[PDB]
Structures are given as structure tokens and as C-alpha cells.
Design a protein around this ligand. Sequence first.
Ligand SMILES: [Ca+2]
Ligand SMILES: [Ca+2]
Ligand SMILES: [Ca+2]
Ligand SMILES: [Ca+2]
Ligand code: NA
Length: 309
Amino acid sequence: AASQSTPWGIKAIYNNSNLTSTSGGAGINIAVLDTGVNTNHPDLSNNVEQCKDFTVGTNFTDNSCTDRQGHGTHVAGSALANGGTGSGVYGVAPEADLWAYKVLGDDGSGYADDIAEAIRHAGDQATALNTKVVINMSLGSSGESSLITNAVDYAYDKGVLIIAAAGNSGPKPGSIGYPGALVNAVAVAALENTIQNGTYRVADFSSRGHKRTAGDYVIQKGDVEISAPGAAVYSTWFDGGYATISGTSMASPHAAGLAAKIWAQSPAASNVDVRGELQTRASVNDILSGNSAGSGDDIASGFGFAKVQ
Ligand SMILES: [Ca+2]
Ligand SMILES: [Ca+2]
Ligand SMILES: [Ca+2]
Ligand SMILES: [Ca+2]
Ligand code: NA
């Protein structure tokens, strides 16, 4: 079984120190584009809906999404782990549907064309099934791939909400990477379990946005958008057990899970509506600590820390 039911970041985003379980996300699909997912993990299996591998062949191999690294399983767990039979770990939106899309191939990892194909496929599925999709991309690079960018824009136009890691190249200004830095991706900064200046603190490793476009509460290319728990995050692992790691990769699925929880309560809302709700929620929880964090919209934390309550 798990040694934690509700990890610190789950409790933090739920804003409840004694939380024993989570809820919500019904009907919303979280597409975790990553190293795959262990679809037999007891705390994930019941939420598995799609399992597709974009690293073998084109376009993809169906009914296949094996994680041999752990990242994708970890990320999926933060987003939507369901506690198993009651003794396992819980993620933010335990009633969401998991679409495990393997885009980081064994081993080493990820070609831009595989990632782009998966982003487009998620958009095509949103359209074909008339269903709501939140993409999570817990991945990043300093360089902008036009294949990935164009795929993001394509999916966003089709109504898909795209959440991504800000990157782990902080704390210096302008360290945000891609796809996080795209105007149609929600870049998520990583918080650590430290309260400073009254708020959770942005981790030093978390990539910062650019000074010239910050402070306006309007997202341009290069802006960090919201913050979520990303340091020392316990979650599911590819072996059917658990692991504790740190990264903006860990923050992203907290936000993707929250987005799904929000969306499930307004299922006819657009991606733009749900994104706006995340922005609003973040803005009332202004993050005030971490390098370059301060009052208002800043390059460390964007608008703030969107929560359940
Ligand atoms: Ca579904
Ligand atoms: Ca390929
Ligand atoms: Ca801005
Ligand atoms: Ca702030
Ligand atoms: Na962005």
C-alpha cells in the first residue's frame, strides 16, 4: 500500500491539513504525454481509458503505453490517483479519465515529432468523441520546436486545455522553456513545502518568466502562469510502488488535475473558460516568496497558486 494518502501538495492545493481523500474530475480526460504510465498500478488502473504509444511506429501503437522510467506514472498519480481500494495515494482529480500517451521513448527520451503527433491526436480525439481534454506536458526544452508549437496551437484551437511544466532551469529570469512558454500553454511553476512571507515559496529550480512582460495579469509568450506543488512530491511509480521527486514536472499535474476538477463542474465550459478560472483562482492566492517573487503577477510564480478552496 501507499505510505501517504494525501501528500503535502495534494493537501496544499485542496487547502486542508487533514484531508484524507480527494474527489472530482468526472468526465474530463487528462492526457498525460510522458514516458508512459503503468496502467496496472492499483491507484491508477481504474481511471485508465486510453493507452497509446507514439514512440513506436507512426502514428501510434494502441493498447500500449509502458512506463519503464517512472515519470509518466508519477505525473499521472499527482493528477488523478484514486486511492486504489482505499489504502493508496490520491491525486487532485481522482474521478478523471487517464489518457496515457507515451511520447518519451525508451530510453533517453523524446522526439519532437512524437510529442507533436500525440498533441494533435489528443485534439482529434477531443473532436471525434466530443469530449473535454486537458493535456499535461511535464517536459521542456530551452528551444522551441515548431512541430510541438504548431501541435499545441492546433489542439488549443480544437478546445483542448494544455498544461505544462515551466522548466527546471531557474532561478534566473527568462529561464522558462517550451512548451510552457507558449501563449497557448499554461506554464506551471513549482512550489516547495516552505511558508515564507505568508505563502508557499517558489523553488529556486523553477524556471522564471521574462521581466518585460510580467506584472500585467495577461499571459504572453514567455510568462509563467500559475504555481503548484513541485518539490518533494510523493506519487505513484512505474513499478507499482511509489517515489518522491522534485520538478516543475510534478507541479504541472497538480494544475492539470485542478483544471479537470474545475471542468467537471462546468462540462460545457471551453478550454479558455477553464484557463480563465485557473488564472482567477491563482490571482487570489498571490505567491510572495521565492527568488523574484513579490506582490502581484511575477516571473517566479505567475498570477499565484490556484487552489480548490
Ligand atoms: Ca473519457
Ligand atoms: Ca516517431
Ligand atoms: Ca504578461
Ligand atoms: Ca506574486
Ligand atoms: Na505559456
